């Protein structure tokens, strides 16, 4: 089948600057007779169904502002935004309504570029009410940082832990254009009281040296 690949996996651009997305096709989506290409663009925001933004590679819809302009023909198409505004942060797809079966694109999330921000790291020891349940869970929190790409590593008595913690990140904050990260290390009570010190190690481009914040049990 005809497979479409959108050019940027992740794309981050400042406010009011133009962004560029491209799609490519192993076949042609142009019927020569009417000169109209059969490629559409959709936009989708977190927690909401996708909304159509362009049909035939250049025609907008009833709600689509004049700031969004399609382009290209044949096998290279371009979605161009004249001035990125705050409400336009979403993931965009491109599909074909030429020959069935129809295919969608990979996806292109649009961040808002901003001065690199260092995470505010916090460490949380497990609660006593959770110990009476039978399992302990240490939490490491990273607050208000940019870019999104950061990594945390767990150390129990400086023994590297892996595959036991699960991460969770927030969407780009509309006000200050920043993220936040929570790493939950789930452990058993008997093993939690077998060791003494618990550490989470953070690495981010916004900090010159890795920041480690840790607590001693008790």
């Amino acid at each position: 089948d005809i497979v479409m690949t959108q050019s940027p996996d992740s794309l981050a651009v400042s406010l009011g600057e133009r962004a560029t997305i491209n799609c490519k096709s192993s076949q042609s989506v142009l019927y020569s007779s009417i000169n109209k290409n059969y490629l559409a663009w959709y936009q989708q925001k977190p927690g909401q169904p996708p909304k159509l933004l362009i049909y035939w590679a250049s025609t907008r819809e009833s709600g689509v502002p004049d700031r969004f302009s399609g382009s290209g023909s044949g096998t290279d198409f371009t979605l161009t935004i004249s001035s990125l505004q705050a409400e336009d942060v979403a993931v965009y797809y491109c599909q074909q309504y030429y020959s069935t079966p129809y295919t969608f694109g990979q996806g292109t999330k649009v961040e808002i570029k901003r001065t690199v921000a260092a995470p505010s790291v916090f460490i949380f020891p497990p609660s006593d009410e959770q110990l009476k349940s039978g399992t302990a869970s240490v939490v490491c929190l990273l607050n208000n940082f940019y870019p999104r790409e950061a990594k945390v590593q767990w150390k129990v008595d400086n023994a590297l832990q892996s595959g036991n913690s699960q991460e969770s990140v927030t969407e780009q904050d509309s006000k200050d254009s920043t993220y936040s990260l929570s790493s939950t290390l789930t452990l058993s009570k008997a093993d939690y009281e077998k060791h003494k010190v618990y550490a989470c190690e953070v690495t981010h481009q916004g900090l010159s040296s890795p920041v480690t914040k840790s607590f001693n049990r008790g």
């Binding site: 559409a40 159509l52 079966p101 129809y102 869970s137 927030t170």
Partner: protein
């Protein structure tokens, strides 16, 4: 005006069959060909099939050819998508969309239906406190609940600045957990009360947790 509403979210075990109803209303629904599209939780969109009430349901994807059966009932204008048997990978959000003809884009979409397949039972969450340069962090850990979702607010909703509620994460045991956090100046750490109000409608549980350091 053309609209498309889908049925309520569904929770099941691997094995059963289920069906989604996609009803259409408004001027001239007759010409609209309805397609189905899946959005897996982490990933993106993927086209499953398209069908026209009046039956030319010819078109399927090779990936979804043997899996599911679609249909329509012209009489009530709804349209369905069917499943012979579920697996753990079938947990996803499903949309129906409409295009006016064979080779047309999907202009009008539906609300979407969340389906969850788990072989796990519905159980109420357990909340735990997360107590501590003038940036004291607080939080609530909501652990081991099923199914999704929970709604967590702070201090009765009065407080909003600096609150973060992370998405749920499905853990080893097949249940979810998430954490809410809010940063507050150190000067208020005894004077002011912090209560997180979690709500899990499938278990009909409402819990308020007062977080405090010591």
């Amino acid at each position: 005006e053309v609209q498309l509403v889908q049925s309520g979210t569904e929770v099941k075990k691997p094995g059963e069959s289920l069906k989604i109803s996609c009803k259409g209303s408004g001027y001239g629904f007759i010409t609209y060909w309805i397609g189905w599209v899946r959005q897996m939780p982490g990933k993106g969109l993927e086209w499953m099939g398209i069908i026209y009430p009046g039956d030319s349901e010819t078109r399927y994807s090779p990936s979804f050819q043997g899996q599911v059966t679609i249909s329509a009932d012209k009489s009530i204008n709804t349209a369905y998508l069917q499943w012979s048997s579920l697996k753990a990978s079938d947990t996803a959000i499903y949309y129906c969309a409409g295009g006016s003809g064979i080779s047309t884009p999907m202009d009008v979409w539906g609300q979407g239906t969340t389906v969850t397949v788990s072989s796990a039972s519905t159980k109420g969450p357990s909340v735990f406190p997360l107590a501590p340069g003038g940036t004291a962090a607080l939080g609530c850990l909501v652990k081991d609940y099923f199914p999704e979702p929970v709604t967590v607010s702070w201090n009765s909703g009065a407080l909003t600045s600096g609150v973060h509620t992370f998405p749920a994460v499905l853990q080893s045991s097949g249940l979810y957990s998430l954490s809410s956090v809010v940063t507050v100046p150190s000067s208020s750490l005894g004077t002011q009360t912090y209560i997180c109000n979690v709500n899990h409608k499938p278990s009909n549980t409402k819990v308020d947790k007062k977080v405090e350091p010591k």
